[PDB]
Design a protein around this nucleic acid. Structure first.
Ligand SMILES: [Mg+2]
Ligand SMILES: [Mg+2]
Ligand SMILES: [Mg+2]
Ligand SMILES: [Mg+2]
Ligand SMILES: [Mg+2]
Ligand SMILES: [Mg+2]
Ligand SMILES: [Mg+2]
Ligand SMILES: [Mg+2]
Ligand SMILES: [Mg+2]
Ligand SMILES: [Mg+2]
Ligand SMILES: [Mg+2]
Ligand SMILES: [Mg+2]
Ligand SMILES: [Mg+2]
Ligand SMILES: [Mg+2]
Ligand SMILES: [Mg+2]
Ligand SMILES: [Mg+2]
Ligand SMILES: [Mg+2]
Ligand SMILES: [Mg+2]
Ligand SMILES: [Mg+2]
Ligand SMILES: [Mg+2]
Ligand SMILES: [Mg+2]
Ligand SMILES: [Mg+2]
Ligand SMILES: [Mg+2]
Ligand SMILES: [Mg+2]
Ligand SMILES: [Mg+2]
Ligand SMILES: [Mg+2]
Ligand SMILES: [Mg+2]
Ligand SMILES: [Mg+2]
Ligand SMILES: [Mg+2]
Ligand SMILES: [Mg+2]
Ligand SMILES: [Mg+2]
Ligand SMILES: [Mg+2]
Ligand SMILES: [Mg+2]
Ligand SMILES: [Mg+2]
Ligand SMILES: [Mg+2]
Ligand SMILES: [Mg+2]
Ligand SMILES: [Mg+2]
Ligand SMILES: [Mg+2]
Ligand SMILES: [Mg+2]
Ligand SMILES: [Mg+2]
Ligand SMILES: [Mg+2]
Ligand SMILES: [Mg+2]
Ligand SMILES: [Mg+2]
Ligand SMILES: [Mg+2]
Ligand SMILES: [Mg+2]
Lengths: 77, 149, 271, 100
RNA sequence: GUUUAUUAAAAACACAGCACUGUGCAAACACGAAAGUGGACGUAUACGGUGUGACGCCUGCCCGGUGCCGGGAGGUUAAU
């Protein structure tokens, strides 16, 4: 499913308002990508499906710090 | 990004400088190869005392060891006596594997990824100058010779 | 030969048979045969994706060798056979070592002729080679687009690619469409022209000739009602709208090429 | 059986291979009965006009007796070979000597 | 040959053949939020769409309008 591994950004719903305010149901998908992250701890690459904003969190924190939080919830990578 | 640099970067960097770089260059190139590290408070402290004084020079003498690795084979020539066609036009193109194996079997113990080829895959029979990437600055000059059997 | 059928019954009248007197009269080599169950134009979801296909004669798949992996091993052509699954005919090649494989039969080929394949080999019809080894301005077929793959381009009866030019790693090919496509030089190409060139001159003759070939009737949009097709309705043969598919997209002059990643390989589009 | 007169021209950089190329084309014909009547390597001679965008081709005149099987087999080896820039093959009217 | 099971069997539909057109293969196209399937274990003498409708003799003039195709300077032009 279109879910970021890191943040948990799922696809939310909403309206697609026209100039005459015709509310047609749509949905906002998150900016997901299957990226490979080098983990310096175990000397390897780890493939994670993450949102573009997730990558910024992985750059803010440590990939190890994020993989610590990922394992706490009970997920795979 | 800040990014503290461990290795000597080609253009912008020069060992332990906190020069601004684009995140892609950090996470795709500088980090995974082990060339630089992100600089966020505690890393700067690891680089300040421990790495810069000791491990920078240990990383430097490894470049001298890499320069020594070129000096393992003093001959700097390899005579490939592979099978050939009717006067020139070789049977198969000499890839990096054959050169790497031929050099490793009796010369420098270098991996295949460092072995570059300036003049393509070498199909013409004759003398060919080949250069390896033992170090970023210092390049080798091995005189490969493809002979028709 | 291309033999016209005599008009003893209407439906026979117009029939033109491509009577090849060589094609083996008997059962094929079983080890390379396998089942090929018909889909009838439906998919995973069980829905007609591609229309106008369904029925026809039951037909087994012959495992044809497009890759030509046997390097430096001569091979005698044992007998030419009729492939029901393909336009071109096939040749039961018997390799010197022991193996037998089916290949597409080139034009100049008979039972007893020898074929070699691999890197060196000879420049002769049927012999597979890398395009780097093949001369410039030479007729080829069973051409790969990617090195080590099977064989994509020019497999249909009478079809052939011509090698126009080459600059090192790339080779410029002129395909039967007219398209000048650039491919990799390491790719292989079986020399010469694909046989059964008379295939094109057959004319079926009757409706049922299409039906036992696994084709169904194509109903014209204009005949249908407006609910079914964009062409529709009108009390007595009306039209008055621009030609379109069943799903609204304009046929009859409309560029549907939109790959964009392969566009670099195309030197010049067909004309 | 039939007398011939092959005159082929070779690319400048592959003029080193011509001593070799002569040894192969001699070996093909001399093995099959008919002898080579004259050997005359003209050498790197200037061209009147540029063939294949270059000057100075390496000419080689054979002049040889052979059967039709071998001479046509030799004719095919010129076309499937990038070294040889053009060639022609004349008819009989007996063997010859000298002239350039 | 098919068709309105249950008021229409026909001149309607189909049809072999004909043409224009799209499609270079991870094909166009179709089903499908997607994965993935058919197309096709096919590869332009193939495949999809549109029209016409065996065979014989043919198929004329118009590109102003509506579409499509190509050009790519100039004008106008969204987010930023
Ligand atoms: Mg959310
Ligand atoms: Mg939610
Ligand atoms: Mg909107
Ligand atoms: Mg509402
Ligand atoms: Mg993956
Ligand atoms: Mg940026
Ligand atoms: Mg039988
Ligand atoms: Mg299937
Ligand atoms: Mg199923
Ligand atoms: Mg169809
Ligand atoms: Mg035709
Ligand atoms: Mg036809
Ligand atoms: Mg039709
Ligand atoms: Mg109706
Ligand atoms: Mg509707
Ligand atoms: Mg429908
Ligand atoms: Mg409609
Ligand atoms: Mg009506
Ligand atoms: Mg009317
Ligand atoms: Mg009208
Ligand atoms: Mg419209
Ligand atoms: Mg429409
Ligand atoms: Mg046109
Ligand atoms: Mg019925
Ligand atoms: Mg009925
Ligand atoms: Mg009724
Ligand atoms: Mg009723
Ligand atoms: Mg009735
Ligand atoms: Mg006709
Ligand atoms: Mg047609
Ligand atoms: Mg869709
Ligand atoms: Mg299939
Ligand atoms: Mg009609
Ligand atoms: Mg009529
Ligand atoms: Mg009519
Ligand atoms: Mg006529
Ligand atoms: Mg008209
Ligand atoms: Mg007029
Ligand atoms: Mg106009
Ligand atoms: Mg336009
Ligand atoms: Mg221009
Ligand atoms: Mg402009
Ligand atoms: Mg402008
Ligand atoms: Mg403007
Ligand atoms: Mg403006």
């Amino acid at each position: 499913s279109r879910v970021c591994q890191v943040t948990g950004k799922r696809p939310v719903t909403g309206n697609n308002r026209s100039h005459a305010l015709n509310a047609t149901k749509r949905r906002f998908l998150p900016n997901l990508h299957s990226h490979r992250f080098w983990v310096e701890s175990e000397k390897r690459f780890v493939t994670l499906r993450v949102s573009a904003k997730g990558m910024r969190v992985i750059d803010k924190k440590g990939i190890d710090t994020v993989l610590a939080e990922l394992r706490a919830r009970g997920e795979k990578y | 990004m800040q990014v503290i640099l461990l290795d000597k970067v080609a253009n912008l960097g020069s060992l332990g400088d906190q020069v601004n770089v684009k995140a892609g260059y950090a996470r795709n190139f500088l980090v995974p190869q082990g060339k630089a590290v992100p600089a966020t408070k505690k890393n700067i402290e690891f680089f300040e005392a421990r790495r810069a004084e000791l491990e920078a020079k240990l990383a430097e003498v490894l470049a001298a060891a890499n320069a020594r690795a070129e000096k393992i084979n003093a001959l700097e020539t390899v005579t490939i006596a592979s099978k050939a066609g009717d006067e020139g036009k070789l049977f198969g193109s000499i890839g990096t594997r054959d050169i790497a194996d031929a050099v490793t079997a009796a010369g420098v113990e270098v991996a295949k990824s460092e072995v570059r080829l300036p003049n393509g895959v070498l199909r013409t029979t004759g003398e060919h100058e080949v250069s390896f990437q033992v170090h970023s600055e210092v390049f080798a000059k091995v005189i490969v010779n493809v002979v028709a059997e | 030969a291309v033999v016209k059928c005599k008009p003893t019954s209407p439906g026979r009248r117009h029939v033109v048979k491509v009577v090849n007197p060589e094609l083996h009269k008997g059962k094929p080599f079983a080890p390379l045969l396998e089942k090929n169950s018909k889909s009838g134009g439906r998919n995973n979801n069980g829905r007609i994706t591609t229309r106008h296909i369904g029925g026809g004669h039951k037909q087994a798949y012959r495992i044809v060798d497009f890759k030509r992996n046997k390097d430096g091993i001569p091979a005698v052509v044992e007998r030419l056979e009729y492939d029901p699954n393909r336009s071109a005919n096939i040749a039961l090649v018997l390799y010197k070592d022991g193996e037998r494989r089916y290949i597409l039969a080139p034009k100049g080929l008979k039972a007893g002729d020898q074929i070699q394949s691999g890197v060196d080999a000879a420049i002769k019809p049927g012999n597979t080679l890398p395009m780097r080894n093949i001369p410039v301005g030479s007729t080829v077929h069973n051409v790969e687009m990617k090195p080590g793959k099977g064989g994509q381009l020019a497999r249909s009866a009478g079809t052939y690619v011509q090698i126009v030019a080459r600059d090192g790693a790339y080779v410029t090919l002129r395909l039967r469409s007219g398209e000048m496509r650039k491919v990799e030089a390491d790719c292989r190409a079986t020399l010469g022209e694909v046989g059964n060139a008379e295939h094109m001159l057959r004319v079926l003759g009757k409706a049922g000739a299409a039906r036992w070939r696994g084709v169904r009737p194509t109903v014209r949009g204009t005949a249908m009602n407006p609910v079914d097709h964009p062409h529709g309705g009108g009390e007595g043969r009306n039209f008055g709208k621009h030609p379109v598919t069943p799903w609204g997209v304009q046929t009859k002059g409309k560029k549907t090429r939109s790959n964009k990643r392969t566009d670099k390989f195309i030197v010049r589009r067909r004309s | 059986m039939r007398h011939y007169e092959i005159v082929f021209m070779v690319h400048p950089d592959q003029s080193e291979q011509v001593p070799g190329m002569i040894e192969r084309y001699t070996a093909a014909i001399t093995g099959a009965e008919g002898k080579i009547h004259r050997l005359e390597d003209w050498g790197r001679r200037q061209l009147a006009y540029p063939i294949n965008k270059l000057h100075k081709a390496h000419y080689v005149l054979m002049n040889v007796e052979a059967p039709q099987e071998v001479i046509d087999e030799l004719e095919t080896t010129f076309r499937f070979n990038d070294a040889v820039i053009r060639s022609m093959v004349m008819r009989t009217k007996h063997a010859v000597t000298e002239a350039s």
